[PDB]
Amino acid sequence: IRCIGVSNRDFVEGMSGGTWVDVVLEHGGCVTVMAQDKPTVDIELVTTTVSNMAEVRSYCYEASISDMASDSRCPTQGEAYLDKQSDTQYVCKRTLVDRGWGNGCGLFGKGSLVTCAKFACSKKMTGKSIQPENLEYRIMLSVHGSQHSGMIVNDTGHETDENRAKVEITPNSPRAEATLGGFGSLGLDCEPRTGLDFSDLYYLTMNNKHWLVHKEWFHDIPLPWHAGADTGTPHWNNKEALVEFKDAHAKRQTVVVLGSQEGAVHTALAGALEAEMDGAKGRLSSGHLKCRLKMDKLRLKGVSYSLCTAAFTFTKIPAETLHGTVTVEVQYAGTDGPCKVPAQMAVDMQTLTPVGRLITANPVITESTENSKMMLELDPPFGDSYIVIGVGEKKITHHWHRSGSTIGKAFEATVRGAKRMAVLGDTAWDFGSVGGALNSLGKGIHQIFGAAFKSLFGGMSWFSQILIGTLLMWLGLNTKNGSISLMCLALGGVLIFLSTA
Amino acid sequence: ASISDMASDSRCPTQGEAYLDKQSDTQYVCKRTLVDRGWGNGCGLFGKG
């Protein structure tokens, strides 16, 4: 439940006898954790809010000019000085102008002309800072079992529902227990500070559109820049790159503004994440969190019930998710109170020997009135199989055909692994990380190689690194020395970055 | 030269940069620098102000 259709979910199975499982949560997909004898719990990150950001260095992307003025001097007399040059609100440029006997001053050298123009800014974009403290993550988890198909994305007063829980996680309280009534409580220790880089990301606003911008792109930008506190009549310490002092001929000088600049910033931003704002807080919808799951206080509600023997009707019928699982929504006719639904994948209906794996929870209908609804999902075997629901001589059976042999599943698993590593960097080694010694060695050497690779390359974008990938591919292909492998290795890294976006 | 009423400002470890309102005057010399702050001066963080 809550993860049936997300199309980017991965199953985390097994643990050290039920002690704990490492899990990385991402915004795109969700993780369904299944234990040996415990209810399957689906966990998903929802939104990451940032709070009380502190404004820093707001820029100007649209200038406005005002009453120009100018002053000139004799070929020998010195340099021009307008009385408006002693004001920090005027742009002033000094140049040389042809003069003599025609304009009014007798001598024929070049003169000196100063022009000044007042600067007014309509619109400005501001950049705000984000400390990795006071950063709140909101995790939503739900459980399989007894909820009918309707309650998959239904967001309501989930405090009462008893099957779905919501957890806030902040650097001031990284540990939390989600109390699932009657199922126990899922303990969840999580690391919020190391989530996503939040010491290099400014929150940038232009006009009701907010981005996450990398610092060192919000400092090497050439526009009139204030600094921090907006108090009264602002002052911009630039007076250049937004006013163009175009010269005429025969001592004519003109001042123009460049227009509105909000088109170069929208295209200068490419590959910077989007965000949205609510009140004083900023909701980012793209992030990365790593929570260790201490699921040793989860129980099974269904056990010790007696199994229902009335009838079962397949109403919505069986359906196939993107990963192979099979969701079934059954309706129970009998009035047998709380009860245990018998369901098993089976082939060779002569002797129903359970095959496949039942990734549900403790199956069980909790309603007691007349007709109840339930939804359970099964992981079927690759060949043809029969979904069997019911006890005896009134068993409803459905025919199911799953496509791809185990080799296909292994290849798709390795593709998922490559994508996850390319996206998450070193941390990807912690996905199903019960944690041994081999996994830790892998994490270490991948961390070293990652630091080196990010220090050499990683100042390049899609096209540029496709280029350097092909070039290093050739160079390694015909170098004839022993370093060829090294160069060829580089290609993989670089080229794989391109074919996973 | 002769000098006059000095003034200063400082705004934290993680905020923007200091700005006096007397920087928008063409009669004042102004210099911007970094100072150690945090837990003894008023702002909780420890970088350079």
Partner: antibody
Framework: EVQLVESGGGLVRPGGSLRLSCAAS????????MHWVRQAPGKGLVWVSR????????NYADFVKGRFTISRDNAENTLYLEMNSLTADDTAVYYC?????????????????????????WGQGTTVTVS | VSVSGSPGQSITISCTGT?????????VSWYQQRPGKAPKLMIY???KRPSGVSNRFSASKSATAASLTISGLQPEDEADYYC??????????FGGGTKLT
């Protein structure tokens, strides 16, 4: 308890100069911000100026376009307000104020933007009459 | 400008600045001046009350104005009340004042 005492207020002609003083005792004067506030007869309170512990930072309101000059001597626990080119609009009672909330920052030096404050320790105020 | 109250009742004095960063009221301070007395501060940092000031006085703040609430009015309470805050980063400004009878 701390007691602040004003001095130097008196009648002076329009355009005259006047030096107000404030004597403090009973606290770490060398570490607190000091304020000068005024209140015209029958009028409300009007903030005038503020200074730090060492005297580095000095802030003045808009109505004082450089007419006032605030200073202090920590070794003598003394505050001063020089006044030049007095007009009739400034005839009022001047209150000397201690700033202890800043004393968060026991140094009283760093003049952060929008720092917390609240003025509870006031002198009795001295009357200046420009007539 | 003024507010009237009866003994035992509660009165609220408001303080509003126009278009100031929507931050200011977090730092508004409230001061009391009885007739012919030196001013005394009742509230600082918007809502915090000093030690020694009676619990009778309370304070509240929003993104648009600040409010000072006095419940169980006493004949002592009749005085002039002034709010103060930052005009800019380096300034201070007192309100128009309210005469509470």
């Amino acid at each position: 308890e701390v007691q602040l005492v004003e001095s130097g207020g008196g009648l002076v002609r329009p355009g005259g100069s006047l030096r107000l003083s404030c004597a403090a005792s009973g606290f770490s004067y060398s570490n607190h911000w000091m304020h000068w506030v005024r209140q015209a007869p029958g009028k409300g309170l009007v903030w005038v100026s503020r200074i730090n512990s060492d005297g580095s930072t000095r802030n003045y309101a808009d109505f004082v376009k450089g007419r006032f000059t605030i200073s202090r001597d920590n070794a003598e626990n003394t505050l001063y307000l020089e006044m030049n080119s007095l007009t009739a609009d400034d005839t009022a009672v001047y209150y000397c104020v201690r700033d202890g909330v800043r004393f968060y920052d026991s140094t009283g030096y760093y003049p952060d933007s929008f720092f917390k404050y609240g003025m509870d320790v006031w002198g009795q105020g001295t009357t200046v009459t420009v007539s | 400008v003024s507010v009237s109250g009866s003994p035992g009742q509660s009165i609220t004095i408001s303080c509003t600045g126009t278009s100031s960063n929507a931050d200011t009221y977090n730092l508004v301070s409230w001061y009391q001046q009885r007739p012919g007395k030196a001013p005394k501060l009742m509230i600082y940092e918007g809502t915090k009350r000093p030690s020694g000031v009676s619990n009778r006085f309370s304070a509240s703040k929003s993104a648009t104005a600040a409010s000072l609430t006095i419940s169980g009015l006493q004949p002592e309470d009749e005085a002039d009340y002034y709010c103060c805050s930052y005009a800019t980063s380096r300034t201070l400004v007192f309100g128009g004042g309210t005469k509470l009878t």
